[PDB]
Structure formats: C-alpha cells, structure tokens
From a paper:
To fully understand the specific features of peptide presentation by HLA-A*2601, we determined the four crystal structures of HLA-A*2601 complexed to SARS-CoV-2 T cell epitope peptides EVF and CVA and two peptides from HPV: DVM and YVA. For the other three peptides, although CVA, DVM, and YVA are all nonapeptides, they show different conformations with residues in P6 or P7 of peptides as the secondary anchors. Meanwhile, for DVM, the side chain of P6-Ile inserts into the pocket C, and the side chains of P5-Tyr and P7-His arch upward, forming the “switchable” bulged conformation due to different position of secondary anchor residue inserted. But for DVM, the large side chains in P5-Thr and P7-His result in potential significant steric obstruction if they insert into pocket C. Instead, P6-Ile with smaller hydrophobic side chain points into the pocket C. Only the residues with short side chain in the middle portion of the peptides (such as P6-Ile of DVM and P7-Val of CVA) can be accommodated in the shallow pocket C. This led to diverse conformations for the HLA-A*2601 if the residues with short side chain are located in the different positions of peptides. When P1 is D or E it leads to the pulling of Arg62 and Arg163 toward P1, resulting in the “close” conformation of pocket A. At this point, P1 is firmly anchored within pocket A. Interestingly, in the HLA-A*2601/DVM structure, the PΩ position is occupied by Met. The PΩ-Met inserts into pocket F and forms similar hydrogen bonds with the peptide backbone of Asn77, Tyr84, and Lys146, thereby stabilizing the PΩ conformation. This observation highlights the versatility of the F pocket in accommodating both tyrosine and methionine residues.
Author numbering:
A (entry chain A): 1 to 274
B (entry chain C): 1 to 9
C (entry chain B): 1 to 99
Amino acid sequence: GSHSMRYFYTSVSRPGRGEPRFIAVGYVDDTQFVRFDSDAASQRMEPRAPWIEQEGPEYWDRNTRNVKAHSQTDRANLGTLRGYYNQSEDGSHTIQRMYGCDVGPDGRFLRGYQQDAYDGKDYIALNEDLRSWTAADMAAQITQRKWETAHEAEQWRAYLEGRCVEWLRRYLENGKETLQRTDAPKTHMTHHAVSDHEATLRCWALSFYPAEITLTWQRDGEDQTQDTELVETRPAGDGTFQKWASVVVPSGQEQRYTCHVQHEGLPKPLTLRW
Amino acid sequence: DVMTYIHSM
Amino acid sequence: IQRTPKIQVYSRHPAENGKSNFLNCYVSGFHPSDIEVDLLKNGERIEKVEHSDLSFSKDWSFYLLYYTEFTPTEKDEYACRVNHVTLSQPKIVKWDRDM
C-alpha cells in the first residue's frame, strides 16, 4: 500500500563524561537500512540492510557528510536548549528528531514531517503544510522565530517533497524482495490451566511483516478486554514481528472465545477457537 | 538519503 | 519524568530442545535511553550478546532488541536482566517458552 522513510536521531549530553553521543537510524517502513553513531570507530554512515549496499561511494560520502553535520548541530542544540531552560551543566538531557515522508500506492508524495523533542517531550514540529511551525513552549518559540527568519521550513519542504520521496521510491525498487512483501502471520493458540476453575487462552501471531496487526478476543461475539492481556508487537530478529493476546476463561467454557487476527497479508481476517 | 544542512535551534 | 522499560524475553521460534534458536530480550517504552540489558543462562551472563541500534517510538520512548543464538535444552533456564535508572534494582525476567 503506502510506504514511509523515516530518520530517527537521538542526542544525549554526557556531563562529566565526553562529548554528547549522537545516534541516527534510517528506516523504510519497519525495516532499518542505515545507522550513524558518533562513538563508533568508522565515523561513517553504515549499511544495515542488504539492498542499501549497492549504493556507490558518493552515496556514502554524502550521507556521512550530512549526518555528521546534523550531529554537530544537535550537539550545539543541547547547550542552546540548556540555556533556554536555564538548566545546570550537571544534568544529562536528550534531543530527539524524527523526519521523513510517506508515499501512496502510486508512489506519489503523501505527506512529510519533522518533529523535535527535548527530554522526551514535544519541543517543535513542522506543520503539515511544510510551511509553518508549531512550538510547544516559550523556549521553542525562540527556535521558531529563528527558523522563520532563516527560511528553514523551505529547506525541509523542498527535501521532504523531493529527495526524500525520490530516494524512498528508489529503495522500494531496489528492495522489492524485502520491502514490498507481506508476510501473513502464522497463528496458533496455547491453553494452560490456571486452576480447576480457570484457564489461560493465548492467541499467537508469528513471522509477520509489516509490524501492524490487530489481535482481539471475543466471548460469544462480544468484544472482550476484561481479563485480557495484549503484549506490544516485538521483533523476531529476522525481519518479522510477533504478538500475542491472552484471556483467562472459566474451565470448560473455552468454546465461547474467539481470537480475531487482522493483518495486511490476510485476505480475510482469521478467527481462532480452542 | 538524509536531509541537508539543518539550522540550529 | 522518566519512563520504566517494558521487558519481553522470548525466542525467535517456539522452542524445541536441541534445535538452534535465538534468545531475544526486547526493552521498550523507556526514557532516558541509557540502559543495560544482559542475557543470563542459569544466572550467568552470556558473553556474546548483540543489540539493535537505538531508536524510538511515536511517543519518544526508546526501544532496543538484545539477542543471541542459543540451543534450548530441558535443563537450562534463561533470563534477561534490565538495569535502568527507574529501577532500584535490576529487573530479572525469566524466559517462559509460551510468552
């Protein structure tokens, strides 16, 4: 269907210790394809997906140059924002940035985004029009006026509507085999007595891609979140994901309960019954 | 392909 | 404020004794990002454990996957020990082959 390219940057100040650490990762959909770590030895953008390895030395030179510039910018930003908030040089603080673009099934630009956080809280975001900013507080309004004067939105808009989408389309082509696949979940149920009175039913989804999935329990067709446990979707390690949902039911009543699995790779949702 | 130069905060 | 990690310890495939597998510890939902995650076999830290590159979710909380290749047996117990600033002592989650 639609696809996305996203970069995730984390900068953490290490007071007492050395320079702040900067880590960048790039994803297409739920597949990571590059990383940069300011502490690693290479000091280069590195491949993390088979289909990005065919990019030439100029690709890696450019992406290293630019992400290294970003890392210096985000180190400067940690001290700047410490000043904005009048915080001491003693505490550790975090700047996060997420940016990227979505394309539709036709491959045409759907939306772009850029949002920044400080200590895990929203700081400033590029608005949906890619022409204006939404600041979270007074410190962020200083940044907004700075970026308005510097025409920073124009720089991001031209990237998000241009090279972001063009290079995403290229990655989807070069990694058709991985990125344009859907792996339907392999499903099963387990059943374990809690006592004579009760038993746990656990509904499993394994080996699926993309990560998006819905697991729901019903009892005689009624939505059932009472006594249910839903774990966060988790990576299997091989590029697929896993999820389960459990419910505790009265012994002998297992037949009333259905687990409902919805996933893009399933032409019709599955219903599982013990 | 990452973004180009980003303006400081 | 700070956000304590959610922890899941699990195998890549449903465990079969004697068959090669991967042991995973997935920590998510935490802030700040400084964290230590160790895989334990019968209480003892496993030497060669790899992890994913630091990333984060829409709510800005971090997630990491730690993993190692292993071959389950009937006798061996596995666990994941998570050391984070939100935890007065490291949280040790035992591997359950049906979780």
